[PDB]
Design a protein around this motif. Structure first.
Motif, PDB file in Angstrom:
ATOM      1  N   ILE A  14      -1.851   1.286 -48.176  1.00 51.47           N
ATOM      2  CA  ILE A  14      -2.615   0.199 -48.666  1.00 51.47           C
ATOM      3  C   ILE A  14      -1.843  -0.883 -48.805  1.00 51.47           C
ATOM      4  N   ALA A  15      -1.784  -2.025 -47.877  1.00 47.36           N
ATOM      5  CA  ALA A  15      -1.084  -3.220 -47.416  1.00 47.36           C
ATOM      6  C   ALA A  15      -2.079  -4.415 -47.360  1.00 47.36           C
ATOM      7  N   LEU A  16      -1.128  -5.645 -47.422  1.00 44.52           N
ATOM      8  CA  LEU A  16      -1.758  -7.026 -47.451  1.00 44.52           C
ATOM      9  C   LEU A  16      -0.844  -7.945 -46.633  1.00 44.52           C
ATOM     10  N   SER A  17      -1.788  -8.688 -45.794  1.00 46.79           N
ATOM     11  CA  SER A  17      -1.408  -9.741 -44.992  1.00 46.79           C
ATOM     12  C   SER A  17      -2.055 -10.977 -45.185  1.00 46.79           C
ATOM     13  N   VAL A  18      -1.308 -12.054 -45.515  1.00 44.38           N
ATOM     14  CA  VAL A  18      -1.844 -13.437 -45.871  1.00 44.38           C
ATOM     15  C   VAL A  18      -1.989 -14.210 -44.504  1.00 44.38           C
ATOM     16  N   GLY A  19      -3.051 -14.955 -44.396  1.00 43.80           N
ATOM     17  CA  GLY A  19      -3.196 -15.855 -43.135  1.00 43.80           C
ATOM     18  C   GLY A  19      -4.238 -16.853 -43.621  1.00 43.80           C
ATOM     19  N   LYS A  20      -4.676 -17.604 -42.375  1.00 44.50           N
ATOM     20  CA  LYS A  20      -5.482 -18.651 -42.790  1.00 44.50           C
ATOM     21  C   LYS A  20      -6.581 -19.136 -41.642  1.00 44.50           C
ATOM     22  N   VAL A  21      -7.884 -19.432 -42.063  1.00 43.07           N
ATOM     23  CA  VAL A  21      -8.833 -20.057 -41.173  1.00 43.07           C
ATOM     24  C   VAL A  21      -8.648 -21.111 -40.481  1.00 43.07           C
ATOM     25  N   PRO A  70     -12.059 -10.228 -67.822  1.00 42.57           N
ATOM     26  CA  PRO A  70     -11.823 -11.438 -66.967  1.00 42.57           C
ATOM     27  C   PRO A  70     -10.358 -11.528 -66.944  1.00 42.57           C
ATOM     28  N   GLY A  71      -9.610 -12.376 -65.776  1.00 41.54           N
ATOM     29  CA  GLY A  71      -8.400 -12.408 -65.658  1.00 41.54           C
ATOM     30  C   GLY A  71      -7.386 -11.325 -65.181  1.00 41.54           C
ATOM     31  N   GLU A  72      -8.185 -10.114 -64.851  1.00 38.78           N
ATOM     32  CA  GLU A  72      -7.516  -9.014 -63.972  1.00 38.78           C
ATOM     33  C   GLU A  72      -8.134  -8.961 -62.844  1.00 38.78           C
ATOM     34  N   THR A  73      -7.109  -8.346 -61.911  1.00 39.18           N
ATOM     35  CA  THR A  73      -8.091  -7.941 -60.648  1.00 39.18           C
ATOM     36  C   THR A  73      -7.776  -6.480 -60.530  1.00 39.18           C
ATOM     37  N   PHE A  74      -8.739  -5.858 -59.946  1.00 40.35           N
ATOM     38  CA  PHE A  74      -8.664  -4.438 -59.593  1.00 40.35           C
ATOM     39  C   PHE A  74      -9.160  -4.052 -58.161  1.00 40.35           C
ATOM     40  N   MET A  75      -8.726  -2.929 -57.964  1.00 37.48           N
ATOM     41  CA  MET A  75      -9.090  -2.258 -56.641  1.00 37.48           C
ATOM     42  C   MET A  75      -9.613  -0.790 -56.811  1.00 37.48           C
ATOM     43  N   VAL A  76     -10.404  -0.349 -56.093  1.00 35.46           N
ATOM     44  CA  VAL A  76     -10.829   0.848 -55.698  1.00 35.46           C
ATOM     45  C   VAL A  76     -10.511   1.280 -54.364  1.00 35.46           C
ATOM     46  N   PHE A  77     -10.545   2.448 -54.133  1.00 37.57           N
ATOM     47  CA  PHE A  77      -9.865   2.966 -52.854  1.00 37.57           C
ATOM     48  C   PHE A  77     -10.295   4.533 -52.672  1.00 37.57           C
ATOM     49  N   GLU A  78     -10.396   4.950 -51.418  1.00 39.16           N
ATOM     50  CA  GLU A  78     -10.576   6.471 -51.471  1.00 39.16           C
ATOM     51  C   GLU A  78      -9.052   7.247 -51.372  1.00 39.16           C
ATOM     52  N   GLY A  79      -9.069   8.520 -52.023  1.00 41.27           N
ATOM     53  CA  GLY A  79      -7.863   9.365 -52.403  1.00 41.27           C
ATOM     54  C   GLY A  79      -8.456  10.694 -52.085  1.00 41.27           C
ATOM     55  N   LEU A  94      -8.533   3.785 -58.503  1.00 36.26           N
ATOM     56  CA  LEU A  94      -8.532   2.311 -59.086  1.00 36.26           C
ATOM     57  C   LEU A  94      -6.767   2.050 -59.264  1.00 36.26           C
ATOM     58  N   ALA A  95      -6.755   0.700 -58.881  1.00 36.13           N
ATOM     59  CA  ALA A  95      -5.286   0.060 -59.091  1.00 36.13           C
ATOM     60  C   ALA A  95      -5.908  -1.227 -59.869  1.00 36.13           C
ATOM     61  N   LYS A  96      -4.558  -1.588 -60.460  1.00 33.52           N
ATOM     62  CA  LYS A  96      -4.521  -3.165 -61.150  1.00 33.52           C
ATOM     63  C   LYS A  96      -3.524  -3.860 -60.540  1.00 33.52           C
ATOM     64  N   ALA A  97      -3.802  -5.314 -60.413  1.00 33.12           N
ATOM     65  CA  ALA A  97      -2.788  -6.104 -59.775  1.00 33.12           C
ATOM     66  C   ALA A  97      -1.830  -6.691 -61.105  1.00 33.12           C
ATOM     67  N   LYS A  98      -0.427  -6.603 -60.776  1.00 33.48           N
ATOM     68  CA  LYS A  98       0.638  -6.923 -61.682  1.00 33.48           C
ATOM     69  C   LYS A  98       0.752  -8.432 -61.642  1.00 33.48           C
ATOM     70  N   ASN A  99       0.176  -8.992 -60.462  1.00 39.03           N
ATOM     71  CA  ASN A  99       0.407 -10.606 -60.518  1.00 39.03           C
ATOM     72  C   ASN A  99      -0.846 -11.316 -59.884  1.00 39.03           C
ATOM     73  N   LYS A 100      -0.950 -12.388 -59.695  1.00 38.96           N
ATOM     74  CA  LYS A 100      -1.918 -13.496 -59.568  1.00 38.96           C
ATOM     75  C   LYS A 100      -1.861 -13.529 -58.085  1.00 38.96           C
ATOM     76  N   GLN A 101      -0.863 -13.423 -57.328  1.00 38.35           N
ATOM     77  CA  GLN A 101      -0.986 -13.414 -55.903  1.00 38.35           C
ATOM     78  C   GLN A 101      -1.369 -11.919 -55.463  1.00 38.35           C
ATOM     79  N   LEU A 102      -1.483 -10.995 -56.202  1.00 33.54           N
ATOM     80  CA  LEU A 102      -2.049  -9.815 -55.350  1.00 33.54           C
ATOM     81  C   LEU A 102      -1.025  -8.954 -54.655  1.00 33.54           C
ATOM     82  N   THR A 103       0.361  -9.418 -54.639  1.00 39.73           N
ATOM     83  CA  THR A 103       1.241  -8.650 -53.876  1.00 39.73           C
ATOM     84  C   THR A 103       1.773  -7.469 -54.737  1.00 39.73           C
TER      85      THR A 103
END
Length: 538
Positions: free
Chosen positions: A197-204, A253-262, A307-316
């Motif tokens: 599971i990865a992230l790439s940041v870009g822009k429209v 509120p103020g947390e970000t989560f993620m679901v995924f398949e395992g 489930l995972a939980k983000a450890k910062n606000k950048q979601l990195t």
């Protein structure tokens, strides 16, 4: 209902996101799928109830890219509440695409992420038959996504399914599954594939002419299977680990989560099931025993939803939490999970194949769904405890076949849709795999018509029903992935606006606004005028 076991008891009770509680989609629950099937259903006719069956897609369908590419798993631009977005007048979607010269079943190992765009704010009656999408091309430059892998000996390197979170300045955080394969010419493994599971940041970048993307030059490795909660390559070389969906839980509120398949983290050939996985009520004359199930071959089917939980606000950076759903001895694959909030409930939707169900079990291709009072809860599988929310037309009395070889007695719509995704208002988009019969069938590689599933029918939160009055007898627009929020932005300031406000803004303002939105400099006076107007609607 045909005679068979009662479904398992579930409470829907919430636990903390951090608790070691995992709901089970049990054998008892899943055996309700057989109970719901009409055994009188003649050859090639649907045996499952119409209210949980996707309307039949026509074999004559338009292609969304005019056959420039194969298109399958697709997703919108979202916020933390899963609202779907246009940017500066353009609806934008991400899709898995592959070279149209490939056999459709060779797409998986050459999959890349591309994008489509179309004008926002167009009524259904004014939209082109094919959806009106323009193909924007690939997201990543050649070689970018391979950068996270230490072992660069891969035979294939792919971008697989994820999600895309949009910020008010048009920045996109693309969450996706970055996959390295290591194979012989014959299709067999050298060593286990490596999905992360990865992230790439870009822009429209969006103007009157269309949409282009900048950035997407850097990839951050976020998660790989751990071996305690989610199965690894060492435990099972064909382990599932993919499909990130991120969200904010209203209850936290103020947390970000993620679901995924395992997959449940058991050593492949030592895996077992236990009583809870079976879930039969005391006394049931259809109950099975743990030993019987451990005998049957079913222990090879141990899919879960993580489930995972983000450890910062950048979601990195993210932290694994215990799985929220396990399907041990029920299915190998609880794919593409999402959490959908409605009426104060958490609905976990997932998709599964007919082929992936354990011994003794069976069900249609499509959407399986679960309801509970929290993102971690004792989830209640929908519709009679079965889990089935939206199955392809299926005669469960006859063999399933495969999308490359349909069974002579099977419904021609058996594989008509996959990678379903539930959108706001219960609208469901999916891609067409195969449509047709044993000796006359076609592959899809383009999106199906969007359909409508009403969630929580008759006051009962555990019940869904297909709306057959939607569009033309249940079928909406081809590839209709509509935006309900609308960004206007110069790349720095932005507002997210409603359909009605988007319309009024586009009409009131003129060509200086077009310059503004294209990122051209304007006077401070003109800019304050534009941005003060916008701010009224954000």
């Amino acid at each position: 209902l045909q005679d068979g076991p009662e479904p398992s008891i579930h409470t829907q009770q919430a636990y903390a996101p951090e608790d070691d509680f995992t709901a089970k989609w049990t054998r008892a629950d899943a055996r309700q799928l057989q109970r719901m099937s009409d055994p009188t259903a003649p050859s090639r006719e649907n045996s499952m109830p119409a209210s949980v069956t996707m309307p039949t897609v026509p074999q004559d369908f338009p292609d969304m890219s005019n056959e420039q590419v194969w298109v399958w798993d697709t997703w919108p631009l979202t916020d933390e509440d899963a609202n779907q977005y246009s940017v500066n007048g353009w609806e934008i979607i991400f899709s898995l695409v592959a070279d149209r010269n490939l056999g459709f079943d060779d797409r998986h190992v050459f999959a890349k992420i591309g994008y489509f765009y179309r004008p926002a704010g167009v009524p259904a009656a004014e939209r082109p038959e094919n959806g009106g999408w323009t193909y924007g091309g690939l997201v990543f430059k050649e070689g970018v996504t391979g950068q996270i892998f230490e072992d660069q000996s891969f035979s294939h390197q792919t971008q697989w399914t994820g999600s895309a979170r949009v910020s008010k300045n048009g920045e996109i955080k693309l969450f996706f599954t970055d996959v390295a394969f290591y194979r012989n010419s014959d299709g067999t493994n050298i060593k286990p594939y490596d999905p992360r599971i990865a992230l790439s940041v870009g822009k429209v970048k969006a103007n009157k002419k269309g949409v282009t993307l900048t950035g997407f030059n850097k990839v951050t490795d976020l998660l790989q299977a751990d071996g305690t909660y989610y199965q690894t390559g060492a435990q099972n070389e064909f382990f599932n680990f993919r499909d990130p969906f991120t969200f904010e839980d209203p209850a936290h509120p103020g947390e970000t989560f993620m679901v995924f398949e395992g997959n449940s983290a058991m050593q492949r050939e030592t895996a077992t099931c236990n009583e809870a996985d079976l879930g039969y009520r005391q006394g049931d004359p259809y109950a099975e025993t743990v030993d019987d199930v451990n005998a049957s071959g079913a222990t090879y089917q141990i899919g879960n939803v993580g489930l995972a939980k983000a450890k910062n606000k950048q979601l990195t950076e993210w932290e694994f939490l215990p799985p929220i759903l396990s399907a041990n001895c029920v299915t190998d694959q609880t794919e593409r999970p999402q959490i959908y909030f409605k009426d104060g409930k958490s609905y976990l939707f997932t998709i599964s194949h007919r082929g992936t169900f354990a011994a003794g079990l069976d069900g249609p291709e499509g959407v399986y769904g679960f309801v509970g009072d929290g993102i971690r809860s004792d989830y209640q599988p929908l519709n009679g405890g079965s889990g089935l929310a939206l199955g392809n037309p299926t005669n469960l009395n006859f063999l399933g076949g495969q999308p490359f070889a349909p069974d002579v007695n099977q419904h021609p719509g058996h594989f008509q849709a996959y990678s379903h995704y539930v959108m706001p208002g219960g609208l469901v988009q999916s891609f067409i795999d195969t449509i047709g019969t044993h000796d006359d069938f076609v592959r899809g590689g383009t999106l199906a018509p969007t359909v409508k599933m009403d969630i929580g029918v008759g006051g009962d939160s555990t019940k869904t029903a297909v709306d057959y009055s939607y569009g033309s007898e249940g079928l909406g627009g081809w590839a209709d992935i509509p935006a309900n929020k609308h960004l206007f932005t110069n790349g720095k300031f932005g507002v997210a606006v409603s359909d009605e406000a988007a319309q009024k803004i586009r009409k009131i303002l003129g060509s200086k606004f077009d310059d503004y939105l294209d990122g051209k400099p304007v006077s401070a006076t003109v800019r304050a005028l534009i941005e003060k107007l916008l701010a009224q609607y954000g």
